[PDB]
Every structure is written in C-alpha cells, then in structure tokens.
Ligand binder design. Structure first.
Ligand SMILES: [Mg+2]
Ligand SMILES: [Zn+2]
Ligand SMILES: [Zn+2]
Lengths: 52, 1648
C-alpha cells in the first residue's frame, strides 16, 4: 500500500502480524524489546523505537 | 572528328616511354579507328602501363606473351609436371627460387581485400606442389588505390581514366554488352542503404522459400477473436498442464532450500581431508613459512651487473661460449675473495650469493661447484687458448674499458678451487615432480598476527611467482618422479633481517611449471615444498595484504548487532578469501557466482524447479571440495541460527551477497587457449545438430545444390510448426504462427502499450577468418617473408657482392613486427618486448628467411651419401614423413625421439656436410653449412639434424562477343554487387568467424565478419536502433528510462508489488533471422510527417542474406579433432561422420549471430513482451509493466485487493506465472532457471534493490580495482585508477579501502624506474575530496599535504586570489598572458607573482622547492607488450573528439613494463637516450633544509646542478592547479582547513545516506565548441596543425570568459587535463556516504 511501506517491519522482513508503528517504519513486537535491550533507546542510528 | 581523336589519339604523343622498350602497345593502338577495338585496346594499354610500373617497382621482368608457369619453368630447363596453371604478371627466378607477383588497383576498402585474398590464395595453392622440382616460391601482390605511376603524372584525371567511359556510354548502339563494371571501375567515387537499385533476379528456390515463411502470419485479425482464443487457452492450460503439477515455477520454503544446499556442495562422501592446508600443495608452504620454522656483496652484484651487460650485447659466436666465459669470470672472482677477506663463505658470503655448493650466475640462474669446473675442463683442454683467443674479442670489440680487473684471466687455479669445492661440501635441492599426519594447527586458534602473516607470505610468494616470467625466453641451461637439482633458476624473495627464501624452477616462458620454495635463513637451507601453479593467474595479491584484510574486516563489521556471530564468521571468511586466491580456477568462479541465485530464491517466494540442478558445478582436484564446504557452511551460520535467527536480515543479505561476489578475485581470463577454442565450437554446433539443420561446405558463390535447399526448407518447416495446445515446453526452438499473429495483429492496430507512432523516419588489416586470435596468420607470414627476401635480396645487389648478411636482418624483422618507437640496443629493446609465443613466431620467420636466402644463391642427383648414417637403427622408417606425411621437412617431429636418438646420428668425421669454421657474416651459397656447424657446436642437436636433412636434399618427393569474361585487367572490378538472389548479393554469402570473449562465468562466443558483411549488419542494426528509439519501454541503448526503471523498481520493492526478475536462456543460438523476417513482414510503422507505410523491403532482402550466412570452422579445432582418436564429444560426432574431404563451412537456419543482429531482437523481445503484458492484464486482475533489455527483463506486477488473511485464492499466483512462462515458450523466449519471482528483492542488470535502500557490492568494485592495472605510462594508469576509485566510492565503500588501493598502485609503479613524483598516482589519506572535488582538487590536497605547515602554499593561494579577483572584479584586468604561459614556467611563475606585488627577497625563495621530472624533453621511450603489427598534449584528444578482437594478459603487461623501465628510456633533447639510474645517481646528497620536509621527492636547488635540465618547480604546478580548478569549481579553494570539532557523537558504522555534490558551481555555462575558435584567436593559429575533420565555415562562435587563462595552462603544463574534463559530464553525481565520513571531514569554507 501507499501509507506506510508495505506492512512488514524493516528489522526482520518476514513478519506481518499485530506489530506496532514507528517513525517512518513498523516494528514487530519481538524486535521491539530485542532492539530495546540490545543497545539503547534507538539503533546505532535513529530509525527505530518510540516509547511504549 | 568523332571526339575520339580529341585527346586520346593525339594526346598519346605526349607521354613518357622512359622504360622497357619503344612502342609495343601504342603501335597497335594508332592503327585502329573502329571504337569497339579502339576501347578494348585502350584500357589494355593502360593496364599494361600499371603492371609495367608495378613490376619494376619490385624489379621483375614482365610476363611477355601471357605464358604459364609450366612453360616458364620449362624455358630454363626445370621440367615440372602438371600444375594449377596460373598466369602471373611477372617473375624473377634467380636460380631455384622464384618471385611471382600480381598487381591490382581497387579503390574501395571493401573490394580491396576480397581481391587480395583471392589472388593470394590463387598463388599460395601453387606453392604446395612445387616439391617435385624443389623450388622455393615467394609470392608478392601489390594492390594500390590509384594509377599513380612514374611514366605520365599526374594530370591523368583528364587522361583516359575519365573520358574512355564517355566514349563507351556515347557510342553504345557496334555490339558491346555494356556494364556498370566499366563505370564503377574507370571512375572514382570516394555506400548507405536504398539497395533497391540492384536487379533482384529470382529462382525456383525462392518461391518455396516464401511458401514457408509468409503463410499463417497475417496480423489483420479482429480483437474479439483473439480474446476468445486466449480464454480457451487459459482453460486448456489450467486443466491439462497446471493442477497436475506440471508447472515450471513453485513456492520456496525456508528449510528445504538449505537442506538441499548442504546436499549439493557439501561433499560428505569424499576422502579429501578436513584441514584446508593438506589439500593444497601451495597453501601449506604459505603455512610453513608463516611460523619461523655490505662490503662483500657490493663487490659481487656490481660485477654481476657488468656480467649480464656483457650477456646483453652479442659478443662471441655461440650462446654457450658467452655462458662459459662469464662463469670463468665469476669463478675466478669466487677464488679471489676467498683469500683476501676474512669474513668468507662461512660468515658473510652466505647472504644470497652461494646457497651451499651452488652459486649465482648470469640471468638469475644457479650453477654448482664441481660441475662448473668439470664442465670448463671439457673444452679448455681440447681448444688450447680459449681465453686469449676469446678475451681479445672483449679487448677490441666492446667499449674496451671492460669495467673489470684481474678476474678475467687464463687457466684458473684449480688447486685452491678444490679447497673451495671441499669447504662447500653438500646440501643440494630436490624440486620434486610427482599425507595424514595433521601437524597443521586449526585456523580458528591462530592469533590475529599469524593470520595477517599468512596473508603477507602469500603476497611475497606471488610477487616472486610473477617475476618468474622476467627470465629471457631464448636462454637455456648448460648441462640441461623426483629429481636432484644440479642447475636451475632462482627468484629469491626477502623476509626478515637474515632470513631469505628461494624459488627454484627449470623452464622459461609464460605457462605453468614445477616450483619449489626453500628457506635459507643463515646459510642453512630447508625444504618447504613443491607445487605446480600457473604464474600469470597470481597478479591480484601482489602488494595487497591490507586491501583484503580491511575488506574482510568491513564485511565482518556489517554484522555488528551481535558478538559471537562476528567472532565466529571472522576466520571462516579469512580462510575463504585465502583459499580462493591460493587456487584460482574457472570452477571456483562458476561455483561462487551461483550463490546469489540461491540467496534471491531464499529471499523471494517463487522459484524455478531446476534451480538446484544449475547451482551444482562438478568437482576436480580436491581443494575445490573444501572451498565448496566453506561456501555452503558460511551460509548456514549467517541464516539458520537459533531463536533470534533472522533478526536484521538486510545486513545478512548484503553480507552473503558480497560473499557470493568473491568470484571476482579469480582471474577473468582463460586458463588455456586451445581448450576454450574447442569449447566454443561444441557450444556453437550443439544446438544445430540437435535441431538437425546443418549443411557442410555450401558452394559459397551464391547458388546451392538440391538437397541443401531441401534441408534448409525442412529446418524452416520444423521452425514454424509448434502447436498452440501441446507440451513441447521450453526445450525446443520454434514459434507457433497463431500466437505470433495475435501479437502482430494487436500491434498493428493500436492496443498494446507501444504502437507504430514512429517519430524520426528510419531511413537516415585484411584478416583471414579461419585463424582468429592467433599471433601470425598465413597471409601475414608470406607477406613478411616476401618483404624481407625482396628487400635484402637487392640491398646486397647495389651495395655489395652478395657477401654481407649480418644480424641486421633481425633488425628488418623486428622493425616490421614491432614497428618503431639502433643496432644491438634498440634491437635489444625490440626483442625484449615480444611475448614467448611471438618470440617463437619471430624465430619461425627468421629461419624461413635465412633458408630462402640460402637458396637464393647460384654462383644434383649424383652423390647423396648419407644424411643420417645407414648403419644405425633407422634409414627411412620414421623419417618417411618427408615425402608423404607432414609435407615439408621443417615441421618434422621430435617427441617420441626423446633426448639421444638425434645425437648418435650427429657423428660423421666432419665432412662436406659440415663447415670447418663458424662464421658471422657468411656469404650466400654456404649459409646452411654455417648453420649446421653453428647448431652442432651449440649443443642444440635436433636443429643440426634438421639442417643436415635439408642439406641432404630431403625435401623432394623423389623428383631427382567480347567484353564477357575478360577479368584480366588491373581495374575491372568483378567484386562489386549488381544482382541479388534471396541467398546472395552477386559477391558471396556473408562470411563470419568465431572467437570467444572471456567473461567471468563462462566464455561467451563472439562472431566477427568480413569487411563487406560489416556494413550490411551496420545498416540493419542502425535501422532497428532507430525504430526502437521511437519506442518507450526498451532499455538496451538508452539511459533515461534506465534511471526511470530504477526509480520505479525502488518504489515497487518499497511498496510491496510482485517484482519478478527474469533471465532468458540461449538467446543467441535459438533466435533466427526467419523469425525476424516473419515478424517484420506484416508490421505497419507509420511515418512521422505524412503517416505512410515504410517500405520495409530492403531490410527483408538483407535479413534473407543473414539467414543464409556462412561461418568458418576454426583451423585450431579442425586440427585438434583430426588429431583426436587417431583413426566422445557432440561436435566430434559431426566431424568424423562427414564423407567429404573435411567440414569447414557451417550454414543453418538457427544461431542469430552473437551480437550481430542484436537491436532487431531487442525490437522482437520488446513487442512480444508487451503482448504478454496484454494477455496477463486480460486474463487476471493485474496491471504489469516491463523493462526488457534484449536478454533479460524485470516486471513490476501489482495486485489490486485482498491484502488480508485467509486468502485461499491470492496465493495461487502460480498458474499466472507458469502461464507467462508457457506463452513465452510459445513466442520463442525460453525462461532460464535463474529467474526468481516475488517480493522483497528485485534485480535488473545486477543492481539488487531491497526494502531499505539497495545493496552495495563491496567485493565487485574492490576486485575490479585490484586486477585492472593495464599500463602505458605512470600518469595514464594514475588517472585510470583515479576514475576506478572514483566510481567505486560512489557506491558505499569506505575511504580506507580506497586509500589502500592507492598505496598499492603507488608501490606498484615504484617497482620500476620511477622513484616518486609529487603528483604521484592518487590521494593517500583522503576524506571529502570525492564529492565536491575532482582530479585537480585531489592533486591540490596532495601538494598541500607535502607542505604540512600551511605557510608556504599560502602565499600561492593569495596570489591566485589576487589574479582571479583581477580577471573579474575591478581596477586591474589582464588580457595579455599567452606569451607568458609559453615561455617555460620559472620566469612565468615569477611573472604571475609580479602581478600580485612581491619582493625579490621572496620571489626566489618560493622558486627553490623543486622536483625532478623525467618527461621534460618529451615522453619516455618504452616499447610495451602489444600485438605484432597493430607534438602537444590536448591537441591529439581534440583531434580525436572532432572525428567523433584478440585479448591479452595483465601479468605479462607488468613484466613488459618493468623490462621497459631499465632500458634507455628517458630522453634528453638531441636524442641519445639514457637511464633513470644515471640521472638519480648524480643527485648530490645533502640535508639542505628543503630535503627534510618530505625527502627524496622534494629537492633543493643546490643539490641538482649535475642534473639541472630535469628540474621543475612544484609551486608553479601548485599555482596552475589552484587557478585551473577555480575556473570550474568554487571560490572556496582559497581558504584554510580546520578540524570539524570532532565531538563525542553516535559512532554508528551503518547509517549510509546519499549526498548530492554541492558547490560545483562553474563560471562558463555550456562549452563544447567555444574553445576551438578560442584556440585560434589567442593561440598562434595552429588550426592548421593537422587540420583534420573541419568544422570551419561548414559545420563558428565563441567569446567565453575565463578560457583565455584556462586553456593555455592546459596547453603548456603537461598533466592538468582540464579540457578533457569540462567537455564531459560527471559519471556518478549520486554519492552515498556514511554518517562519520561527514562529521569528520575537512571543512573548507568560502569566506570564514
Ligand atoms: Mg536479471
Ligand atoms: Zn520484526
Ligand atoms: Zn593438515
């Protein structure tokens, strides 16, 4: 579709279930808490992670 | 007065009869008055004039009464039997050796060569049967382009060449059948289309040719028939092909893929051991060395330099007495230093000179003690003097200073030499030709230093491997399944403070050999191994031991998200990149490039069913099993991990894709030439034999027999007979006429997405074809032998008495081969530029020329004694291959005669068959006795046996109404088209020839054409390029819609459309010109202005010729098949079964030449693809769009609705895509198994777009930068590596890999004469100089980085700012500078500093920093490795701009470049070239202040007096660079440089974004022609400096602002190059960089 990008999350490509949104992109619920306790409140860059 | 006596009968009183006789043809020209005789006896007179000039130019007698070769040999007494009965123009016959010549004049470049080949092969057939008389024939043919004789000249344009055709065309009504031959011959014109003026006769073959092409193709069908047919076809397909699981595509699963991969490459069932080192013979040698297992030398290397300088100049008689004299010198020097010094052999001379019982020698060779002296006692006891008899030749025939001492003396002291031979007792090498003790530690346990050290040792070994071809290709040994190594070569490489390393071998040349690395640390030798390797495959890892480690570390750094994934994949990748380099093969390329198809099939959803049958390449040679295990085991550790497996899949995707692109580490070129020249003939003929439409040897002048017509018609009938409802799927080539007619019918009326709009009206040396890629052809060899015999057969006719033929004949040969640019120095630099195979070509020419000149002399069948003696084991049992087999005794074999069959035959008692003494300038009539004696004394025995068998007379086979077919003229142009059938053009049948092209997967074939068939192809390709250029969706020869396809495909992957990546298979051999005829026959293509039908009939008549074309069987495969099986391949089956003499010509319906009809098939694959878009839009809900590119396509199909769960109907896309594949089989387009369909990944021309951005290909661009070093000059390869490192930093590599490729190419120049230039190659230590910069800004940063204080280069930027502000703004303006630029530079720099206002205390202070040039008085004369027979700076490229095959290797290029940098290369004014060693040894060494900022690149003035003519400043070049870039980029270049504050910010390595090149704001606004008119108004008017291709007053305006100051700088300074830049657009402008390469880059403001 046209808003947003498809429905998959950018982290793992293969995931279209009850995921959550994020700044310009979606995130799955596994990848959210993984990337939350991986590094910080972000990536190494700033794509991800709005607060809960 | 009939206007025939006007200026014919009376102007013929005015000519010059200045040669052979008085009136001979003119007396029988005055007599006639009747014009039928007056013309026929007129052009015969003019042709007699042309042949009479052309014979005395070659100095032969005229063939007087048109007599044949049989009666012309039986004139003198040489009685010859029957013969092919040819008429020559002239003949010489100086006694058993005859020159035969023919002359002709053809104006056109097309019909020049088709007469030259014709009369050459009419003469060269005559040579093969002059054995019965034993005469050596030499043929010569001269064709010219005019009648420019010596007799009457040169207002011939008003003579008979113009008006005899006027007399013909006027008085045509007398009987003559008038021709376009006589107009086209006698006139002079200098070619495009509208071929319709030819006659078009037709035959009974052409009507059945048209009954098989244009029958069912109609294309006027209405649409609602076609829609019903397509719905019925879909019903049949879903019933009886799909739903029975007979489709070709299927879904993918994320477990069965990797569980069939590890049963594909991972060989479980092989006995190859598990560690990588034991599997490869070269990779444990690298492992064994990777653990550690000056006052005398200066007195030896200088003497060895003098020694091989003596070896360079020819001094003595034979090429063994040179080696014996030189080792006598070295052996006396060995005895000398043993007693003088104290630090003898035991302490200090074991630093490389002696290795234990063996010592160094002349051309990087070794020879042992006690066999050197046993060899030198051989002839010094037989020949009494041999020293004073031989040192006199060095006493008064060299330069006679000797550069030597009491070393070269008489009979050496053998007494202390035995003390030498008993101190040096024994350690002698093995070099073994020709298991389970795993003493190799596991690679994952080695500390990081030893892994990097395993890279270093491979660098050093590979450098010695490439240097092993530097040895001379004509030098041999003295003495000459493991062995024991008496003498050998050596290529020693250095490791540490005392350790060494040697590399023994035993042959010379450029192919694979037996090598044996030792390791001699402190004089103690040590075994390390032995291996075979092909040395020219090892060019990549030469100085690159930090490119590859930083590459592997970058790929590891992509996997940053988790440790114990990058501490686990780090040694697997290092060993992968190490084992790929340690064994290159085509099998490793063909494996590793096939894993991107696997990775896309794992990424997308749908894939072909024969995918896993194409990924498997079968194995050889043991190590390939381990490289396949490491490939397929690196995959299942990136993907397929535990619970957090596919966490960041984009990083894993680009990681495994760049692992798959490590097939570019292995070399792109061929492993062997004859196996690929076979493998590209059983890839040419295997589709045609299976299809069954092969005729062999057509009659080739046009017409055909009956059964060849019938085979052609049967192939046509099988082609157009596929049935629209059967199951002959993608295996069999053809086309059904129903679906093709549907495609044409919907194209004619406008319903497809491309119509017949048709803007822009669509009408708008002598190589032979059998032998492609060879070094020397047959025709070229007899050209060259004819050249040298006819040249040096009259040199000592007018200058001597046939008594003077020195080694200047080799100078004739070498200047004919290598051209030019004297007498044993440039003869040496010409002979040291021939590759080994063309060295053998040279030797085969020169012994032939010497044989002919030995036969040239005159001033028997009664005494033939014994050429071999008739008491040995043979008389003529196996040397009967001299009168039946192997026609001439020059190619008599010695293979089964191994090493001593021949030398037993070489013992007579030195009779008349040998000569008593070796000569040097031996007269003719006794050459072959000199040659057999100089081959006897040589210890080169089989050559001497062949010279005896030439001497013993063993070459014989025991000899002991008119104007109709008078093509007997010099200008009657029979090879010109007048009529044409459907197969012919009155000339021939459009010949072609085969070669290969050396890609990285598999070698694609390549067809070349004759000169007459290279313009017809050009007509058709230009027509279809025009017609396709009117269209909208093709992508082959455009760029606008290629960027538009990229911009659509990024969006289609980022939104979620089904993005299927297709690839068609066998596009070359399966297409056919019959398909393009039947397609184009019923198109419309309406004109732009008036909309009238284009007459497509000329392209029909050319495509019929393309249909009936002929090719040539290559002669190297036609000999390698008749050698084979001696009275197992699909081509070999159709080579043995033919009951003709031999097959040589192949004609068939198929094959559509590879690249020959390329744009036409782009049209076909465009229109039929749009038709399949229509069918899939009709039969489904989708809306497709394609981007075909003549071989492959991409199709971005979107699905309207149902993006929700519980689909049950949407997941059955399989019948759609299998039906697309079914119809594509129906048209002709077969889809290959490498074609993967789905979302998440799209690929088109290898671009690989992805959800996030795109995937950068690190490995492709780095491995393209590394082995693409082709070398002409250092500044040429310097800007070449600048453009490669430019286009590879556009694509996301880091700056560290770029800087290490820069360091590699700097150190790769410096392995030759060049010391260091301040311009260098390219910028080491760079950051931001690539986005807002060019070549000028990188050289500017390099020169500013030399002066690393920013106090001296400033005061040059301020001067540039003053002159630049005073050309544009205020109160001073400069308009008089061209006289200041051209006066040299030093005073010019002081003049441009005078404009700013400077003191004399500082205008000479900045004039002091200076650099040594080597291209000051011109350019370096270096002769490079190129093919046999292949003023200022910017003027040549502007002359190239105004005018709008066989391959070679890279390591041989670097060896030829390093050999042509130690010769007399540098130039010094008046000629008389010198060395680079001579110039750099005269520099005065001082610590003179200036030389302590960057030493031995920047010198002071007071240390360059002795060499002062090679000394320029850099502040002039720095001022020139700062001015000429600020012409064309920025005013910010005049500021300073400061740190960008470098804060503690987020240190991400993976936030690649894209940047636009900012601040490239020029001044000048669209140049291109406004400098050519500027290059006359302020330059001196050198518009007439070779005024080629004018735009003056036919094809000018000007006055652009800054070019007055900004072209003269390009004109005089050698290496700015700014007008090459500003006449071109940028190549990237899409730069993609990191986040910390823009927060850590130098900030140079405009005004700050
Ligand atoms: Mg493709
Ligand atoms: Zn996710
Ligand atoms: Zn081992």
């Amino acid at each position: 579709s046209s808003l947003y990008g498809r429905y998959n999350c950018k982290c793992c490509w293969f995931a279209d279930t009850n995921l959550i949104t994020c700044n310009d992109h979606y995130l799955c619920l596994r990848c959210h808490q993984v990337m939350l306790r991986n590094s910080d409140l972000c990536n190494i860059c700033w794509k991800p992670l709005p607060t809960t | 007065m009939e206007e025939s006596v006007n200026e014919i009968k009376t102007l013929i009183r005015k000519h010059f009869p200045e040669r052979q006789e008085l009136a001979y043809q003119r007396d029988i020209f005055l007599s006639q008055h009747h014009p039928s005789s007056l013309l026929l006896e007129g052009f015969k007179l003019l042709s007699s004039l042309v042949e009479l000039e052309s014979c005395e130019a070659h100095a032969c007698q005229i063939n007087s009464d048109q007599k044949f070769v049989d009666v012309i040999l039986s004139d003198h007494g040489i009685l010859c039997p029957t013969l092919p009965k040819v008429i020559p123009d002239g003949f010489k016959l100086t006694g058993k050796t005859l020159i035969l010549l023919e002359t002709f004049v053809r104006v056109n470049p097309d019909e020049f060569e088709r007469k030259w080949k014709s009369d050459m092969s009419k003469l060269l057939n005559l040579k093969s049967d002059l054995l019965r008389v034993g005469i050596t024939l030499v043929p010569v043919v001269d064709g010219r382009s005019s009648y420019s004789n010596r007799f009457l000249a040169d207002w011939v344009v008003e003579r008979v060449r113009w008006l005899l055709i006027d007399i013909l065309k006027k008085s045509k009504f007398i009987e003559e059948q008038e021709y376009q031959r006589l107009i086209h011959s006698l006139s002079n014109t200098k070619g495009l289309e509208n071929i319709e003026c030819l006659k078009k006769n037709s035959l009974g073959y052409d009507e059945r040719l048209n009954e098989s092409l244009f029958v069912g193709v109609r294309g006027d069908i209405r649409e609602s028939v076609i829609r019903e047919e397509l719905i019925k076809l879909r019903f049949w397909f879903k019933k009886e092909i799909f739903d029975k699981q007979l489709g070709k595509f299927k879904f993918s699963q994320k477990s069965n893929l990797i569980n069939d991969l590890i049963l594909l490459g991972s060989h479980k069932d092989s006995d190859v051991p598990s560690c990588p080192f034991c599997a490869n013979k070269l990779m444990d040698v690298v492992y064994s060395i990777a653990l550690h297992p000056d006052a005398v030398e200066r007195c030896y290397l200088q003497a060895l330099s003098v020694c091989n300088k003596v070896k360079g100049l020819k001094v003595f008689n034979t090429r063994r007495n040179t080696l014996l004299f030189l080792d006598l010198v070295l052996l006396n020097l060995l005895c000398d230093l043993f007693k003088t010094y104290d630090g003898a052999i035991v302490r200090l001379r074991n630093a490389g000179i002696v290795v234990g019982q063996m010592l160094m020698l002349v051309n990087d060779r070794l020879l042992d003690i006690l066999e050197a002296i046993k060899l030198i006692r051989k002839k010094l006891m037989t020949s009494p003097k041999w020293v004073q008899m031989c040192s006199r030749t060095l006493k008064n025939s060299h330069q006679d200073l000797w550069l030597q001492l009491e070393k070269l003396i008489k009979h050496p002291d053998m007494d202390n030499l035995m003390i030498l031979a008993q101190v040096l007792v024994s350690d002698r090498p093995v070099m073994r030709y020709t298991e389970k003790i795993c003493r190799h530690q596991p690679f994952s346990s080695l500390v990081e230093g030893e892994q990097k050290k395993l890279f270093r040792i491979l660098s050093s070994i590979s450098l010695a491997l490439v240097n092993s071809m530097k040895t001379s290709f004509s030098s041999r040994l003295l003495i000459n399944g493991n062995v024991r190594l008496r003498e050998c070569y050596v290529q020693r490489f250095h490791l540490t403070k005392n350790t060494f390393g040697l590399l023994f071998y035993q042959k010379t040349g450029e192919k694979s050999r037996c090598y044996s690395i030792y390791l001699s640390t402190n004089g103690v030798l040590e075994e390390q191994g032995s291996f075979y390797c092909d040395p020219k495959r090892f060019f990549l890892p030469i100085f690159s031991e930090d490119v590859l480690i930083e590459m592997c570390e970058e790929m590891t750094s992509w996997l940053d998200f988790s440790h114990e994934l990058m501490t686990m994949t780090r040694p697997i990748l290092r060993l992968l990149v190490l084992a790929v380099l340690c064994s290159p093969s085509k099998r490793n390329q063909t494996f590793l490039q096939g894993l991107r198809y696997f990775l896309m099939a794992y990424a997308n959803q749908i894939h072909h069913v024969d995918l896993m049958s194409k990924l498997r390449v079968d194995c050889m040679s043991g190590s390939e099993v381990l490289i396949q295990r490491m490939a397929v085991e690196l995959f299942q550790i990136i993907l397929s991990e535990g619970e957090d497996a596919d966490l960041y899949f984009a990083r894993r995707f680009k990681y495994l894709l760049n692992v798959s692109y490590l097939c570019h580490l292995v070399t792109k070129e061929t492993p062997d030439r004859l196996t690929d020249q076979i493998k590209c003939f059983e890839k040419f003929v295997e589709p045609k034999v299976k299809f069954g439409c092969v005729v062999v040897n057509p009659p080739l002048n046009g017409s055909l027999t009956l059964e060849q017509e019938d085979t052609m018609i049967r192939g046509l009938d099988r082609f157009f007979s596929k049935e629209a409802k059967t199951s002959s799927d993608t295996q069999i080539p053809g086309v059904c006429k129903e679906i093709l007619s549907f495609c044409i019918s919907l194209f004619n009326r406008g319903r497809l997405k491309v119509t017949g709009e048709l803007k822009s009206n669509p009408y708008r040396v002598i190589p032979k074809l059998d032998e492609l890629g060879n070094i020397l052809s047959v025709y070229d060899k007899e050209k060259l032998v004819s050249t040298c015999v006819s040249t040096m057969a009259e040199r000592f006719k007018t200058k001597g008495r046939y008594n003077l033929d020195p080694d200047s004949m080799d100078y004739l040969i070498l200047k004919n081969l290598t051209g030019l640019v004297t007498n044993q120095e440039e003869l040496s630099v010409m002979y040291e530029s021939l590759t080994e195979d063309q060295v053998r070509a040279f030797e085969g020419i020169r012994n032939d020329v010497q044989m002919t000149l030995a036969k040239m002399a005159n001033s028997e069948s009664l005494e033939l004694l014994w050429a071999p003696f008739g008491v040995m084991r043979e008389i003529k049992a196996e040397v009967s291959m001299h009168e039946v087999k192997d026609f001439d005794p020059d190619v008599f074999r010695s293979d089964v005669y191994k090493e001593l069959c021949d030398t037993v035959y070489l013992s007579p008692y030195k009779l008349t068959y040998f000569l008593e003494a070796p000569q040097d300038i031996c007269p003719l009539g006794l050459l072959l006795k000199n040659l057999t004696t100089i081959a006897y004394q040589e210890e080169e025995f089989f050559e001497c046996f062949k010279y005896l068998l030439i001497q013993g007379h063993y070459d014989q086979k025991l000899g002991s109404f008119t104007n109709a077919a008078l093509r007997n003229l010099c200008f009657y142009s029979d090879d010109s088209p007048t009529e044409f059938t459907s197969i012919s053009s009155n000339t021939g049948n459009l010949k072609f020839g085969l070669s290969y092209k050396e890609q990285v997967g598999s070698n694609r074939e390549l067809y070349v054409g004759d000169l007459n068939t290279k313009l017809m192809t050009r007509l058709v390709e230009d027509f279809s390029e025009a017609v396709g250029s009117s269209m909208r969706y093709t992508c082959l020869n455009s760029e606008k819609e290629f960027e538009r396809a990229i911009c659509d495909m990024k969006m289609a992957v980022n939104n979620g459309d089904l993005s299927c990546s297709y690839d068609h298979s066998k596009w070359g051999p399966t297409m056919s010109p019959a398909l393009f005829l039947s397609f184009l026959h019923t198109l419309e293509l309406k004109n732009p202005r008036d909309r009238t039908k284009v007459n497509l009939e000329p392209v029909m008549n050319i495509l019929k010729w393309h249909l009936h074309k002929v090719v040539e069987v290559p002669i190297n495969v036609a000999e390698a098949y008749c050698v084979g099986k001696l009275k197992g391949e699909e081509f070999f089956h159709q080579y043995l079964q033919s009951r003709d003499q031999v097959p040589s010509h192949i004609m068939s319906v198929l094959d559509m030449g590879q690249g020959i009809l390329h744009n036409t098939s782009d049209l076909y694959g465009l229109i039929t693809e749009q038709f399949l878009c229509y069918a899939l839009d009709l039969l489904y809900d989708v809306i497709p769009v394609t981007y075909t590119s003549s071989d492959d396509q991409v199709s971005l199909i979107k699905i309207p609705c149902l993006s929700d769960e519980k689909c049950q109907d949407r997941t059955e896309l399989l019948e759609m895509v299998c039906f697309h594949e079914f119809l594509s089989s129906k048209l002709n387009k077969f889809i290959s198994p490498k074609s993967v369909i789905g979302t998440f990944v799209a690929e088109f021309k290898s671009r690989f777009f992805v959800m996030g951005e795109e995937t950068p290909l690190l490995t492709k661009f780095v491995s393209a930068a590394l082995h693409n070093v082709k070398c002409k000059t250092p500044t040429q390869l310097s800007e070449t590596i600048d453009t490669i490192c430019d286009q590879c930093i556009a694509n996301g590599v880091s700056t560290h890999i770029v800087s290490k490729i820069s360091i590699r190419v700097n150190q790769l120049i410096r392995y030759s004469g060049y010391r260091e230039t301040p311009f260098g190659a390219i910028e080491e230590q760079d950051v931001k100089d690539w986005v807002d910069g060019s070549r000028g800004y990188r050289l500017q940063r390099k020169i500013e980085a030399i002066f690393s204080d920013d106090k001296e280069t400033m005061f040059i930027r301020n001067c540039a700012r003053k002159v630049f502000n005073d050309i544009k703004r205020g109160k001073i303006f400069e308009e008089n500078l061209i006289n200041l630029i051209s006066r040299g530079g030093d005073e010019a720099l002081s003049g441009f500093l005078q404009y700013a206002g400077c003191s004399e205390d500082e205008i000479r202070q900045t004039l002091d920093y200076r650099w040594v040039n080597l291209a000051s008085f011109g350019d370096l004369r270096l002769v490079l490795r190129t093919k046999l027979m292949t003023m200022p700076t910017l003027i040549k490229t502007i002359q190239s701009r105004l005018s709008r095959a066989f391959q070679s290797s890279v390591a041989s290029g670097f060896i030829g470049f390093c050999k042509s940098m130690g010769s007399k290369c540098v130039r010094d004014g008046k000629g008389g070239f010198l060395y680079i060693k001579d110039i750099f040894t005269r520099i005065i060494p001082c610590l003179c202040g200036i030389c302590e900022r960057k030493p031995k690149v920047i010198y002071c003035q007071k240390s360059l007096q002795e060499v002062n003519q090679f000394s320029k400043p850099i502040l002039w070049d720095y001022f020139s660079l700062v001015l000429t870039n600020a012409c064309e980029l920025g005013e910010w270049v005049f500021s300073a440089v400061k740190s960008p504050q470098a804060p503690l910010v987020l240190c991400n390595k993976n936030f690649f974004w894209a940047v636009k090149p900012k601040a490239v704001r020029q001044i000048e606004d669209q140049l291109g022609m406004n400098h050519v008119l500027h290059s006359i108004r302020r330059n001196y008017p050198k518009l007439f400096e070779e005024h080629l291709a004018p735009f003056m007053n036919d094809l000018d305006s000007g006055r652009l602002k800054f070019l007055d100051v900004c072209v003269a700088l390009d004109m005089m300074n050698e290496n700015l190059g700014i007008i090459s830049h500003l006449l071109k657009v940028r190549d990237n402008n899409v730069y993609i960089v990191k986040q910390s390469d823009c927060a850590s880059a130098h900030v140079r403001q405009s005004e700050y």
